[PDB]
Structure formats: C-alpha cells, structure tokens
Design brief:
alpha/beta, seven-stranded mixed β-sheet, binds chloride ion, binds ligand 71Q, Rossmann fold, phospholipase activity, 30% helix, globular, cell membrane, EC 3.1.2.-, AB_hydrolase_fold
Length: 223
C-alpha cells in the first residue's frame, strides 16, 4: 500500500496489464495514458513504488522500485532490491491469477526502471505471461542471465520494446543492446523493437498506439 492506480474493465476483466512507472513518479500518469487506449475486457494496474533513498541522487528519498547507483556500462546495479521488487511484482501477478485472470492473460510492462523491472520479472517468473511492454528501459542484471536461451515458462514470451532515438537519459544504444540480448534469451520471432524519432526520455502518442496494437493482439477478446 498505497493501493495501485486501477483502470477497471468495462465488463468483468478477462485479461490485465500491470504497468510499472519510472523514478520519481506514481502510477497515476501512466494509468491515465492506459485509460486513453483501454480495452473493454482489460483491467490496468499501475502500482506505486515506495519512497526510498536513491544513491545516484545523494540518498534523496523518492519513489523508486530499487536503488540506482550509476548510468554507465560498468555501473553496479542493486541486485538485492531488484530481486526483492521482482518477487513483489510476482505476488501481484499471483493475486490477479487467484482472483480469476490467468497469468497467460497478463501483460507486464513499465517505463525506464519500471520497464527494467518488468523485463527482469517476466524473464525470471515461471508463471507464463502473455507479454511485456518495455518502454525506454534496459535489461537489469544482464550478466546474471544465461548466455543462451532462458527456457522455462516464458521462453516464447512476446516483447514490445520501445525507445526514443533522442533519449538523453537511457541511451538508445542500451535499448538496442537490451533487445539484442532479449533475442538470445527468448524466441526472437516474438521480440519487436520500435523507435520514435525525436522522442526523448518520454512517451508519445504513436508509441501508445503501438502499445495498444500489441496489447490487443496478445489479449484479444475471448468467449
Ligand atoms: O541503473 C542503471 C544502470 N545501467 C547501467 C548501464 N546499462 C547498460 O549498459 C545496459 C545495456 C543493456 C542493458 O543494460 C543500463 C543500466 N541505469 C539507468 C538508470 C536511470 C534512472 F533510473 F536513474 F533513471 C536512468 C538511466 C540509466 Cl542508463
Ligand atoms: Cl473485473
Ligand atoms: Cl527510471
Ligand atoms: Cl474477453
């Protein structure tokens, strides 16, 4: 708690989207973005990161899923916080399953550190998921993954990875290096990289339209 921001389905939800915001934010802005592309049968859940000290910014307390120590290829990542946060997301997936939405009808996603967390959670959980929408982010703890395919429940998971070509905070190059790594961890036929010309560390309407088409293709209406 506080309770996640929820976009209810218009009718009993047969699928769900769990979207994780980035550093400094809450789930409200992203909930309004998903409300503008909402499908009648999908529930959208945007949980709020706890407020915690961020090492990168002199331990200033701000909403963050885990600690951030640096932005360069050699920078250390918060292994314990990332794993802890991923088990918390797995518990939210579990709640949705027990409450009637199978995990193969759930898409996980996020922006920046939230996107990184969504990839890490999807690529470690054995709860089969429908897909991932990874926006302006990177694969965290990349060296801990195998050198080949991950195997397991989510070996054929569909992933939409989005990036702004003018991102001044998460270089396009880290988005590209991440998708090249995702194409070796899972079936590459279901991994798609979309880039938005002129977009910085932000979102845009064309990206939300591509996210909507991906969500609708993977979580179509069912009888
Ligand atoms: O935490 C990190 C660590 N970063 C190391 C460098 N890296 C890779 O070399 C790479 C290539 C493929 C996968 O990883 C990405 C991760 N970064 C980050 C955080 C923020 C924000 F959280 F503070 F906002 C912003 C921007 C950045 Cl880059
Ligand atoms: Cl419902
Ligand atoms: Cl972030
Ligand atoms: Cl349906």
């Amino acid at each position: 708690t506080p309770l996640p921001a929820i976009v209810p389905a218009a009718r009993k939800a047969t699928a769900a989207v769990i979207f994780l915001h980035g550093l400094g934010d809450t789930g409200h802005g992203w909930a309004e973005a998903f409300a503008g592309i909402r499908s009648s049968h999908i529930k959208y859940i945007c949980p709020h990161a706890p407020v915690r000290p961020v090492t990168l910014n002199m331990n200033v307390a701000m909403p963050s899923w885990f600690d951030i120590i640096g932005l360069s290829p050699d920078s250390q990542e918060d292994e314990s916080g990332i794993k802890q946060a991923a088990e918390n997301i797995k518990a939210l997936i579990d709640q949705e399953v027990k409450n009637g939405i199978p995990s193969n009808r759930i898409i996980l996603g996020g922006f920046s550190q939230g996107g990184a967390l969504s990839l890490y959670t999807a690529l470690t959980t054995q709860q089969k998921l429908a897909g991932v929408t990874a926006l302006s982010c990177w694969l965290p703890l990349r060296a801990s993954f195998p050198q080949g395919p991950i195997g397991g429940a989510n070996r054929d998971i569909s992933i939409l990875q989005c990036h702004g070509d003018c991102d001044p905070l998460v270089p396009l190059m880290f988005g590209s290096l991440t998708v090249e790594k995702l194409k070796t961890l899972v079936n590459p036929a279901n991994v798609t990289f979309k880039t938005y010309e002129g977009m910085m560390h932000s979102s845009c309407q064309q990206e939300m339209m591509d996210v909507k088409q991906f969500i609708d293709k993977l979580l179509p209406p069912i009888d």
